[PDB]
Amino acid sequence: AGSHCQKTSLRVNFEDIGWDSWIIAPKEYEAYECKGGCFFPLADDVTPTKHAIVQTLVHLKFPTKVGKACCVPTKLSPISVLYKDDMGVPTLKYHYEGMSVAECGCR
Amino acid sequence: AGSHCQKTSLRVNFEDIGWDSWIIAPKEYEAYECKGGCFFPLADDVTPTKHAIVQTLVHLKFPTKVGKACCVPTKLSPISVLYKDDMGVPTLKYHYEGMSVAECGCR
């Protein structure tokens, strides 16, 4: 199937999320999103752990008692932001970690 | 709030999931499950990445276009299983990795 767990675009405006109080720049960045579902047969590039597999199997058997595996970011990349310091000096954070999806997987 | 992302019990029977074809023992093990939700204010022991935070914020603003952060296992533990080899010899896998939840978090 072609509707499995995968990286798709998500452009994030810092004002929308209340972060423009401390981020001067940029206005928007490409965060990613991980979209789709984790069901058998698994999409090939989704990594999965043995727990995710077992959980997906248990969820088929008891769909009302046990959740499914979740499609989530499993590796993240940094971006750079311009924020303000104590004297109000615009300052660059070169690698602000965990901001964009590098990889998605079932977990 | 007390309904946030956390480790709860999940006992898994290998027959239920079709794994008893290759696992002699045990019949059942404690896999865990990660239950609850990822919403603000975040539960304290949930780790979260900056992406999970940004995504949760974007989901509040656009709940129909963007998913929430997911409560998932973020660290896994091994267990031991007894399986069968080529001559049909019962063989012990001492650390079969990724079988039980050690930690949960929002991702």
Curated annotation (Swiss-Prot), chains A, B:
Query: Where located?
Result: Secreted
> Which tissues is it found in, per the record?
Detected in blood plasma (at protein level).
Q: How is it modified after translation?
A: A reversible disulfide bond can be formed between the two subunits in the homodimer; this has no effect on GDF2 activity.
- Member of which family? Belongs to the TGF-beta family.
- Provide the disease association from the record: Telangiectasia, hereditary hemorrhagic, 5: A multisystemic vascular dysplasia leading to dilation of permanent blood vessels and arteriovenous malformations of skin, mucosa, and viscera. The disease is characterized by recurrent epistaxis and gastro-intestinal hemorrhage. Visceral involvement includes arteriovenous malformations of the lung, liver, and brain.
Subunit structure of this chain's protein: Homodimer; disulfide-linked. Detected in extracellular fluid as mature homodimer, and in complex with its propeptide. Interacts with ACVRL1, BMPR2 and ACVR2B with high affinity (in vitro). Identified in a complex with ACVRL1 and ACVR2B. Has ten times lower affinity for ACVR2A (in vitro). Interacts with ENG, forming a heterotetramer with a 2:2 stoichiometry. Can form a heteromeric complex with ENG and ACVRL1. Interacts with type I receptor ACVR1.
Name the record gives this protein? Growth/differentiation factor 2
Species of origin reads Homo sapiens
Gene name, please? Answer: GDF2
